[PDB]
Design a protein around this ligand. Sequence first.
Ligand code: HEM
Ligand code: HEM
Ligand code: HEM
Ligand code: HEM
Ligand code: D7Y
Lengths: 461, 461, 461, 461
Amino acid sequence: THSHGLFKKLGIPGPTPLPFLGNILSYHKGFCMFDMECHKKYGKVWGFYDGQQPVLAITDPDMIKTVLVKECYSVFTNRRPFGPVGFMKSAISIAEDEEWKRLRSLLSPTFTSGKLKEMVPIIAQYGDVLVRNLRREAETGKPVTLKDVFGAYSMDVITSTSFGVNIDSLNNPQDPFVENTKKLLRFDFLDPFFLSITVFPFLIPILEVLNICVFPREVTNFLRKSVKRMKESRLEDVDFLQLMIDSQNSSHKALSDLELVAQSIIFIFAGYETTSSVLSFIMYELATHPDVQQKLQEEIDAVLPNKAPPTYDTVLQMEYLDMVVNETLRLFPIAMRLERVCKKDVEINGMFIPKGVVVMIPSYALHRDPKYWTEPEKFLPERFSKKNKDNIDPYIYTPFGSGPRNCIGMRFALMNMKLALIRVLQNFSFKPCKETQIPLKLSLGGLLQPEKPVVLKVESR
Amino acid sequence: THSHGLFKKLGIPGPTPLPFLGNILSYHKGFCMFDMECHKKYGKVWGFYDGQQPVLAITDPDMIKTVLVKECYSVFTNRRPFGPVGFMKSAISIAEDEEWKRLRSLLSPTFTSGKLKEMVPIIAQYGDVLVRNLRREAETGKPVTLKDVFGAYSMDVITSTSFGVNIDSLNNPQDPFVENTKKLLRFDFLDPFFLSITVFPFLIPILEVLNICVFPREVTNFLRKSVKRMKESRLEDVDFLQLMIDSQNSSHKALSDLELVAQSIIFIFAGYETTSSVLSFIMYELATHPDVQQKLQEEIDAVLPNKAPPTYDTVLQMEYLDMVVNETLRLFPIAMRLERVCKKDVEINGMFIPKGVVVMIPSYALHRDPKYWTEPEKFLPERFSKKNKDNIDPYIYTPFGSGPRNCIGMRFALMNMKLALIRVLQNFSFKPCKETQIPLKLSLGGLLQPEKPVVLKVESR
Amino acid sequence: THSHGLFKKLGIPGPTPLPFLGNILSYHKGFCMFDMECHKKYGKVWGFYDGQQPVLAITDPDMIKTVLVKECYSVFTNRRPFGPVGFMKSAISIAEDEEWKRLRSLLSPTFTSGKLKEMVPIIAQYGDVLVRNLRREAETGKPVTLKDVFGAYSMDVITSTSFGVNIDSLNNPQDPFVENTKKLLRFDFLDPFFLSITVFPFLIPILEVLNICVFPREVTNFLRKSVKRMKESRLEDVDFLQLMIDSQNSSHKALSDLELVAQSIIFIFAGYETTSSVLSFIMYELATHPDVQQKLQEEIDAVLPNKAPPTYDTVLQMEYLDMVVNETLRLFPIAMRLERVCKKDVEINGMFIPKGVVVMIPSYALHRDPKYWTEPEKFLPERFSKKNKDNIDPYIYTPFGSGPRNCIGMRFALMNMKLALIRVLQNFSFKPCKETQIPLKLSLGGLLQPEKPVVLKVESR
Amino acid sequence: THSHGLFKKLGIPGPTPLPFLGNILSYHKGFCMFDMECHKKYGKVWGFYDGQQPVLAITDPDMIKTVLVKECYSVFTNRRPFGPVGFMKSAISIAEDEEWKRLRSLLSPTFTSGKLKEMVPIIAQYGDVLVRNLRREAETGKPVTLKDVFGAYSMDVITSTSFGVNIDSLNNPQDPFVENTKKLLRFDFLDPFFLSITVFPFLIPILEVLNICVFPREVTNFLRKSVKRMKESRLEDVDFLQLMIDSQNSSHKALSDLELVAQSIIFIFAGYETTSSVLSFIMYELATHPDVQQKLQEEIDAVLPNKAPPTYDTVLQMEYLDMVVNETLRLFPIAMRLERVCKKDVEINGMFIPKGVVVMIPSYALHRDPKYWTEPEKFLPERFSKKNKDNIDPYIYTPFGSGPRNCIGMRFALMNMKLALIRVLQNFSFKPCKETQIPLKLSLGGLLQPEKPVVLKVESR
Ligand code: HEM
Ligand code: HEM
Ligand code: HEM
Ligand code: HEM
Ligand SMILES: CC(C)N[C@@H](CSCCNC(=O)OC(C)(C)C)C(=O)NCc1cccnc1
């Protein structure tokens, strides 16, 4: 009813869809569990329906590369719509085709290594802020909740690198600026609202015409004016805003004032919970594998003796650091899937893909596939040693996606976390508590996030 | 298209409706302006369409009494639906027919004079809090914004009379409890969202099935658990909650746990912005009529010499106080209209009213009708002197409605404000500022509220 | 999601509902099969969900009588809404509460035995027409399709008893009047359109505002003017129209012109396919039980020798006729279920029934319950002999419902069929063909109708 | 609300839009009147809103050519969506981009002059049928209704040229095949249904998921099987079907079975009412200008003496015929407007056109613009004399559109009408009646069609 006949025709296997719901009832255990099970039951490819919407999973690295890289421009340029977005229609991660291509161009030079290297001293300052607060909770032997302290850090780093605003959000939890921003939390695509959207995507236009937006009308309205104040306070009298302001001082067609705001917002949304979540997954791994934590602290003390301040260059110097981070991202690729809409009838690597189908790469499951990874469930940073790193297919390991539409904030994200990890590990050790969920259970929900929030003992070195 | 033919048939006059919109474009100057104009152009009765929905305005006191009192139970029992309400369907002001009749019964004894007289010492304590904060801004000769300081007061009084929670919300603007509650602001029925609802009332069910609610899912979810904590902290170990808890210790059928929560919420919503708004309109009048302010302070010093603490009995003693308050409510009846749905074909005072029509009383306009009020625009408390008070028809002056479905918090509202006014006027005088909007312009929007927020000098007596 | 918790709470058993769909996937084998299975699996009562909509099945005769008779006015007055109906909102079978009560009053005297006895000679004339056409197909030994020849008859009888229009619809299949009317076919509540309505009842208002109607806008528009012609051709210069016209020559409030049209339409819809279907089920039984057919012809020849024309009085004289008809209706009660909406919280025969629930009586299943009927599947007219007829509970056998809201055209329906059967059986015998589906399979769909259309040999006596 | 700000920004003039409705209330006098008025009030370009949807009218021949010809492929490839179309999504006139380009390719060779020249003897046979029936009404001096007799002809020609089915639809008005087909009438885009679609285009997806289709589910379902019978009766044992069947005996990708059906349907819909309407407008002109009618009959008798049967070659021989036809099409271009959706930000002839805008050419108004046409309202075939025909801009006179997406059935349409006109005028003269609407008033509605149906005396030569 009525496109539920598609994959049966094409010869592609898959779970049988119920009328209207398609296969969504199978998300009761989460995106990730659904995806592993399918991959095991059905093989290298399979199909399922999010409501009426046909989704084609693929697991062949060649075929993955064709979608994400080769035929990105021609065919697989956009992601799937997901709900009423109002003006956030112009955010880069949401935009489509030529508007996207334009925005990606105007915004790429913002994420170069040159710009990033300038942003280092800023991101650093809040490392120290992170430490002082951590210590206050280490001196009072009270088990620490990672996401909050990391949240406050991620928040602190975002505010400063995007707008110049400098706040201790942990101690200023109630700053109007800190407030709005913390409501920019990841979207739970299996919460009642979005599941309804899936069964009733014909309801999205209805919601749009009522100016209802999955980005709360208020947080947005606060930042719009906030920016249009900053914009007009800097003008005239180092951050993403500035870089964007300088850019509309001319693809092409510049950057409109409202366009600029939407990017500003999408970066917060992109960097905030992600940076904080990943830092938590890492700290958890580091606490449940005390040797890894020790090795890392020794690597750090070697590169930066006397607890020397980390620098851009010293960060990229640290290899085990890079290993620890990568392996965590294998275990917890917070995007879970990559997706592209098929805009044309095509044939890639011998398979016909009809227009309109959503093509999906199941990153979580691929990251834990036995056929590529020895002891996949196990946390083993050595997989990423300069020795073994060559035996890792870049289209099986894709925490940041691949191709022209991969994570634009990748370099920034990695640099951010690593700066945090270094300054923190220079100072503290992190130990499980009786109350620490071991082994960490993943949310049965729609985000990659722990079933129970990570809590750990923190002692001063 | 298609019921736009109704009033033409019945012989009832009114503005010509555009297809789909009915007459709503005529709200560009606001509910109140629309209503005065119609009353003048069309007479004692008229009709118009909120979208497809037929609305019948009436201005005859007999006919008003039949609707609000005589035929309340039989015919005119409910108000008009207005949007997706989810579980707030059970709030008393929203409920219908027998469920309403039941809730009104379970909740009436809560608002008796006996209960109210017990609540006095509590409401008082925050009078003093109001004073201390006011003084801090009087000692620093900085023009004061009424709604905030009154808001904080209204908020303080609500929290304490409904849940026991005691907070200085002005100095604790960032208490989690103070936060959620301040988002319970009056609904702007001419904002884009609600106007859309009017043209598309067929969209309300759609929104309901998506669990979208005009009461933010979060504020509600916070209070639901907050109550279910309090409930289980008091149980077992003077406020509305308690009174409601004691009541479900048995109309009939008790009060369900979720029912109780919805009342709790609706009271905040009812009392919060209203109490604060009305106090602001009064203080404004008192500043732009310095003699009234002086007379009032003299009345107060006579009843409570040496600035004696006000009491339940001393409050009802004060007649000019009561006059000042009533006249303000004439000028600014914050409900603006009263409404009832016609549930049956009926004939009242010689007029046929078909099923489904919304019957509306235009209180604002009636409060300013020349044919009942000499110099209606003028602020003249003497209209309400025990001498003249008899010449005022109770179905022309209806700040609190009338009948079985009138404002349940009337006595409480009046007592609250008066306690505030007394303690404040015992201590301060209130003087216009250069920046004070004189004469106050009303919002062209959908709430009765000043175009520009009231700001006034405050000096210590 | 979200009322799917209802019956679990109340202690009422039933199939587990899927999110959104409720239990509708269980209609794949049809209303009737679903109902028998439930009754067997769950007992005397059970619950299920048509989408979100709670349905409570009941099988206790006392409890059935309370719903259909005792508390009809107070509680169980209306049927469930089913789709966009536009002006057909005023048809009696669709109307609600007091409007219904009014229409039932204005239209009841139309269906008295006195009026019916006047309509006899008319319904007769088309008996003879039925015979002549039948003979043309008996003389050409060509197997006859019952529903068509009966259809043409039912159609002929409707046209004449409701509007005076006299046509041989079988030989005039292409008369504009015959055309429109044949499109008034029973609604398939398990066809894609209505199932969608069930999952999305929030879409009915949307469809209404687009003037989309399950009664085709054209058939209706043709009859509206047709009537308003007839009305004004008779006025001024014996049928339902006339009876209705005389009635608005004055409950109360008369009958509006549009109200009259809607009744006219609903009668066609009620009588057309029903009369024709039932006549087919009977003729089928009579052919697969040749003795019953013989006995019946002998009863008929006894009462009306020399093939005397049947009369009102001679029809009610015939007992085996009445037996044959009743038993057929037991086996094929074309309504399948009876339903009432619960308009109030009530308790009937010891069970609480909350407001809003649909209360359903599963007539088909009850008609085939072992615990009341020996060899239920078997066609045995003797069950209805004046001897055994007393052992049949009127709230288990309900082909026409019961109570104030039972089939208004019952007497007419029975009289119509019997007149047909008599004139036909006076003349022909009816014999199975090689192509006759034996045993008749019921539609797995939403109407009570044969899987394969009944076809039988017809020979001249 | 919310795109109603577009043209104000761009500097493009136009009527002020009401909230939600845009400018649609201005269609009360019809598309054509609205368009002339705008062109006069606002100049060479202007804008208006069909609901939220921005429409840009243009009248410069260069700019028109860029849209219809130059940038057809790149930018202006599709027409505007208009409603729920279900499987008719695949009809060529409805399809988009590459699917359209494909269908246009597969179907073009069907409309060559070679194929058309083969179809001539067929279209002829029904000329004679047209004559015989006409004569029956000429011999009984009873004023004739053109559209019916022409309708029957158009219908007869369609059936035969597309499926081989040969019927006298005028005398067989009640052939099942003739029936379904006559319900394929032009869509009234100002009827209640489509206007609603315009204010609520967000309702189209809702309607689609309910399988509701502006092409009646039944007519379509009858033709689908009809074709799939014919298909399998011809296979195996000269018309469009055959030409299409031979084509899927292989752009590319052939023609699916369902694709073929949708074309079949769209041709009926395209040719039926159009051919019949245009023939009526011409016959009307010919009756209200008796000299033109005489000249034409003399031209015809010169080319085909003794009433010789017309042939493909003799038809193209006749110049005044071609003149008469063209001028009629100037006066009544039954498409009224041409439209293309702007799929990209572009700049054509110095004007920026943003993505999403509908670009509209107002053919009716252009055909009656004083600045190109002397006495535009007057019917003057000499405008099209081989002398003056050169002074006519092909992008001002566009009865069939222009460019890659122009009327594919143009040659066929012209040939059809002319064959009809010749055979008819060889035999009859056509004279106004007392009841003939002179001067013909156009429908204030949404189709180009006479306010009152054309009726004329017909006498035998
Ligand atoms: C640990 C942190 C992060 C991870 C693991 C991550 C991962 C990803 C992934 C998997 C995608 C989808 C890529 C694809 O479709 O191939 C993505 C897209 C994107 N990410 Fe990140 N991300 C992170 C942090 C950030 C940060 C800090 C930013 C800050 C600017 C950012 C901005 C974006 C944007 C703008 C896109 C959409 C790119 C486009 O459509 O052109 N992300 N990210
Ligand atoms: C200055 C303050 C207030 C004013 C001027 C005011 C006025 C009104 C008015 C005009 C109505 C509609 C009455 C009708 O339809 O006839 C109403 C209803 C209502 N009000 Fe108030 N109100 C005030 C404060 C409050 C407060 C403090 C409460 C606290 C409990 C409250 C609770 C309610 C409730 C529960 C209803 C609906 C009554 C029902 O439907 O049974 N109001 N109010
Ligand atoms: C063999 C023929 C028929 C059968 C078995 C039948 C059965 C029924 C049944 C079971 C109901 C529902 C009763 C209930 O809810 O308790 C009903 C309602 C109704 N029937 Fe019939 N029916 C037949 C023929 C007719 C005819 C010929 C008419 C012509 C007037 C008619 C008019 C109606 C009307 C108007 C209602 C709704 C009554 C109300 O709501 O007041 N039916 N019928
Ligand atoms: C007097 C008769 C006719 C007139 C005045 C007429 C006019 C038109 C016009 C103005 C268009 C729009 C062209 C554009 O957008 O530029 C059109 C499109 C079309 N017409 Fe006709 N037409 C007529 C008869 C027919 C007939 C007989 C057919 C039979 C096949 C036909 C098939 C089509 C098709 C298939 C399209 C869409 C073309 C495409 O999108 O590729 N029309 N017609
Ligand atoms: C649709 C938009 C609104 N959602 C995402 C799209 S980008 C990928 C992350 N989300 C994801 O899992 O979505 C799918 C399943 C890949 C389609 C967004 O705006 N992300 C900013 C961001 C988040 C996290 C890491 N980096 C950047």
